[PDB]
Amino acid sequence: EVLITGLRTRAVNVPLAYPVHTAVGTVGTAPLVLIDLATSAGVVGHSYLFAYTPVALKSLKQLLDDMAAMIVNEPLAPVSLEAMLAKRFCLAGYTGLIRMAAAGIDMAAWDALGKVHETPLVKLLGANARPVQAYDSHSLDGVKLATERAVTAAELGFRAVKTKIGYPALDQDLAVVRSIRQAVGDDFGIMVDYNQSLDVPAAIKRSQALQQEGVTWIEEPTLQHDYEGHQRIQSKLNVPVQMGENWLGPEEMFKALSIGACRLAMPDAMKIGGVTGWIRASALAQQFGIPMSSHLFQEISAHLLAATPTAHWLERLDLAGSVIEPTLTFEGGNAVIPDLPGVGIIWREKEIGKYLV
Amino acid sequence: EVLITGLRTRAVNVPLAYPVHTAVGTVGTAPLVLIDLATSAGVVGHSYLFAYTPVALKSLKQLLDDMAAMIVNEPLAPVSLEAMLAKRFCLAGYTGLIRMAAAGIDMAAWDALGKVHETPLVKLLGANARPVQAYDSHSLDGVKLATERAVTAAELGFRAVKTKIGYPALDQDLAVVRSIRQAVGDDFGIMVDYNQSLDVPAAIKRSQALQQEGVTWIEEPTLQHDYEGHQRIQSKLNVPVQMGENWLGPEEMFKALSIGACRLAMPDAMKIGGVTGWIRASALAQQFGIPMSSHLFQEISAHLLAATPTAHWLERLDLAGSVIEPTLTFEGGNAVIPDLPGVGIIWREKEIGKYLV
Amino acid sequence: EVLITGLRTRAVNVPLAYPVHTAVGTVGTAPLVLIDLATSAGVVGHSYLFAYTPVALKSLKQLLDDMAAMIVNEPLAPVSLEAMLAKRFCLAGYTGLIRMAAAGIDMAAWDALGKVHETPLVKLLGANARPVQAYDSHSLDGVKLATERAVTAAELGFRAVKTKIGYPALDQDLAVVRSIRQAVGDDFGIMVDYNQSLDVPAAIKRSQALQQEGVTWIEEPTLQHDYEGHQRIQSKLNVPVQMGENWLGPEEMFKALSIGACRLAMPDAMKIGGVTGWIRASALAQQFGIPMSSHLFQEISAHLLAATPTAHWLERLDLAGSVIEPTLTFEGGNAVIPDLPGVGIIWREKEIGKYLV
Amino acid sequence: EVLITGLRTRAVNVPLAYPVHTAVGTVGTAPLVLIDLATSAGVVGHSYLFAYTPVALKSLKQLLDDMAAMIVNEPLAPVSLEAMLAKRFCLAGYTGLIRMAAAGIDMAAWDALGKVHETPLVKLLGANARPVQAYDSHSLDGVKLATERAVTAAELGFRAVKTKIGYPALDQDLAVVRSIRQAVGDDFGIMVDYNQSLDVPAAIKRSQALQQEGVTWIEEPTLQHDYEGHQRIQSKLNVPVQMGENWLGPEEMFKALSIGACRLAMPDAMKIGGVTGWIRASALAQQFGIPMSSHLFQEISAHLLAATPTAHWLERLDLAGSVIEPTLTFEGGNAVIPDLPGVGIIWREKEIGKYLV
């Protein structure tokens, strides 16, 4: 009944006020692929992909362009489209950039399906919109900038902030975390993210020191794929280990949770397999008793978290704000889904032209 | 926007063409609760429950009637409704009859949501309709009647049948299976169901004998809650052990799959928690690598299996045919979803009056 | 030789001085089903069921009324009656309300058997009566009322009290527990009950804080069915995790203990399967080295704990005191079994009429 | 001392004598990226990548081209280069196409290092050249063509062949294997490949049937990422389950071997991470006691298997024969490494122009 009739992609390198410094490199500009999925119903699904590094940006766009051939003239049925793509890429490897591209399609197909039915995505998934608590996500900022950004976040009504750590010395990690605590006060969350930067023994040592400071969670202390190493680190901690932004599909989540890698999860809407993958991930987090937060993609994650039985936090890190209208709002630090069909992404068409690659 | 405005239930004891004989007793007629869920949009959601024994029938209706005040004025958002009911019944025990009642509400709410959007439930879930292979489900019929029924099913185009076994002697089980096999030939499925009738050593001995006959699966060989015992039985078999019709919620499925109880699953749309529970169950079966079939509820199960990654068989056992229009049809032994909004259940209002308890 | 000759049920909604506030809802009045089991010996067995919420009250009564057909004219042999009911409800699901109703029958049958033999139940079970230490069980009361109730309990001779926690902030849980400690002094038990209200990481954080206060146990920190989550919480604690009030049958206890969910158990005489189920549960707690307390049902639990090899505490929470004579007494905070045949329940017939539903 | 000075890639779609038919689709021609790595020493390293589907071909080339700036001016030290690339792609996800691109760089860098030292790669790795038994790799060819191809291979001196199976019926798998066996005799290897086409119960049933026929190994019976499912299949078999062609890096191999997924391994030189990844994989297979074969990449795999402690078979499947000189030869079914520095890859420059995408 409704068919996909076109796929348009636009590669952009977009401005961020504050470059995302990490222990393993700076993300100084956001390389995104913006996706428009045309349909026989006239509505156009919107989504985007994050390419992490501009090195991958043109490759990701080209891959999606070539993938168009597989989906045009197929029905707008995201679950069936996903199964078809999983089969088509069985031999190549349905992971990494291929999986990310499949997820971009999925996110745009669900946005379009929401638009077909003139209903916000959360409602199409069978849930009510609810406000979801959000933390403001910062970077490897040093004491001066971490303090400045934390005061700003608290003024904006956020109740938690995340900072990136993994400086050369533990004492530097501690100094930044302690300075943020002075800026925000005691009844306020401080999440920390190591971005895979430590080995297991260093992570045990650093994390036990951070736990004495009362941090909210310790995210990706070691190499993302090392689920057994994360379990060994978690075994030495009361604070929860958080991970999941790098799980490519719910199958990788399942493997990590099966061995007790972490006590918190935070899938990325792109890497986990879009809406279809997120819903499957939510069913796993529920059974394994794991509170589930989001990673990036704040626009769609506000909808998805509202349908997630163990919903925890929304990450506010506004990578696409320069090119997407601010229809997602924050009240008392909680993300509020807009009353728009599908996801609520409206492009800033005049702005996009400035950033095209 | 769309609110629930009322709930009506009707308790019936309905005729079946053949009484369902099992090793642990006979289900001679079908005790059902038929559910109507009124909404502020003018559409009415329909579902029903199976009470198994008339002894539970009036209790189940009374419970639903007393739950009306919990759901009236709530939004028609089945995922959010399910979370609310789980919380309200946290103390009483969200299992057994209470969980079955919540599932009947869920199935009616999803039917209504499909009607609000003028779309079949399968499409609302994001999948394409597809025909699903069905097996014709029979009973503890003895050699003559089992064989007759199998021939009739083969003539109607079914490619498998299920018979119930657990006669006093193993030789009687084998005589039935052999007689069916002679009548239907080697290219035909024969599933067998023990209906929890054997202890573990008996199940190992009977199952290894049936395996030498060539059966398709061996269903519920022992007490349904004994997941470890099912695992011990499965450990002695090449043929797959099938179970799941008695799982109350996806949490019970998760416990059974976690310990290797079975190599096939067949959740019951009511006991698993309606559409909401089924979708969660489907995520679990995908990750555990378990082909997933249905139990009863053929009308909604045709939709649900179309959205299930590891969909296997639909059970054809038409409990409600006396009171529901035959909009679900079978072509070449495959169930075909009707082109109707929601589930496609239409009451036979003239017939329901005959069977009221 | 002795046959069951009648079953009478009465649904009542009975007054409690102090409504049972919990983190997940208030139990403001006690919905009970009162059971009279007539016999061919003339004696009448007495028991009752707790329905938790008035939503379930009429359904539970109706279920028991319909179950009467299965037990009238059967011998007064509770172990054989239980096996018969387990078989009769094999297909429907011998759990939830069905199991609770079966347990009400069992508790009344044993009371009647005690009366046939003119002997208190504890003696029929082969044990001597002994006083059993009891704690006074309170609710989510806030600082003022928790202090008031704790002073009263200490004046009455109880040596321990339980309070319900799970306020929005950990600091609120701590304030109440600390205030109770000022009211009762240092050589006095303070149990705490979270009523399933936390996720696993929150339970680890809160429980480690409470353990620094010296609480006696931490009860049901997370969803009752999540035995693996309880084990993960227990793994992070020196204080024992307590659970079991929600186990429906000894089979659910077995599953929880097999995976190390808890270091203490507290079966509910109704949910565990009555006297027959309690005795089986006691044999399991003995082998798994788990001290075993009771949940509610103080009248019969005084007998059952006296026959329990690992008996620990009796919960004093007098749900049925408005309708049962106070033949159970307390001396120095220990429950003292009355010298009456069977359980010692004598109805307050004049009072029951005030509360009938 | 020796630096990388440039990178050139060429994307081709090349003819194969026989299209590779599999149960999950056909690879009709070979999409390849041919890589030239220039150095300050004047030598040029050569390698290539297989893109599986033309849909990934332009994306893979674009990614390599964009990676040029990362590796130009870096020393020609493949182990250090690999560590650098792992770190640079830590966030994007060092797997899938990105990891394949890094492996193509690695293979070209090692070829160049062999040329810098005027020595075949096998000798640079510290091993002697030795002939390695090879099997001739065929496809889902049907009875007539499978049997013809097997006879031709036997005539050329190969002592084993691999056929792809997973026809719609098990009897069709068996008919193919039996026909080959009749034509080649009892002293000959017949490997079979299911190309991920079966669910676990289907794989158990089909595999136990093939085992009774006498096959050499059963390759990828189910979804490649499902290591637990492969273990369940292997647990039901005497014949070895073979897998590994889809492991992206030795970390995936380590996960699969840790849970007993298979009794044989066959890493793909590209997906495992080039020479650097292969050498790591070889260390793992030695410790886990797993005989290790190759997948594709016959030119470099002849060198690598000569340095592999548990070397088993080389797969002869000549994907690049249209564009690479036939310096690798076969004598008595054994691959013979050419006496040339590095890998021995020489481009057919006149032929490459025909096939450019």
Ligand SMILES: O=C(O)C(O)(C(F)(F)F)C(F)(F)F
């Ligand atoms: O079957 C295999 O091994 C293949 O990788 C395929 F692509 F078909 F999956 C190949 F290339 F060798 F044919």
Ligand SMILES: O=C(O)C(O)(C(F)(F)F)C(F)(F)F
């Ligand atoms: O908390 C408990 O134990 C209860 O059963 C409850 F219902 F509240 F859960 C009660 F009420 F009896 F105290």
Ligand SMILES: O=C(O)C(O)(C(F)(F)F)C(F)(F)F
């Ligand atoms: O056998 C089964 O599946 C049944 O649930 C039974 F009730 F008999 F247990 C039914 F209804 F399908 F017949």
Ligand SMILES: O=C(O)C(O)(C(F)(F)F)C(F)(F)F
């Ligand atoms: O840290 C993260 O989550 C990121 O994905 C990164 F790329 F940095 F890894 C970012 F940038 F978006 F913040």
Ligand SMILES: [Mg+2]
């Ligand atoms: Mg992060």
Ligand SMILES: [Mg+2]
């Ligand atoms: Mg059955």
Ligand SMILES: [Mg+2]
């Ligand atoms: Mg309690």
Ligand SMILES: [Mg+2]
């Ligand atoms: Mg292969």
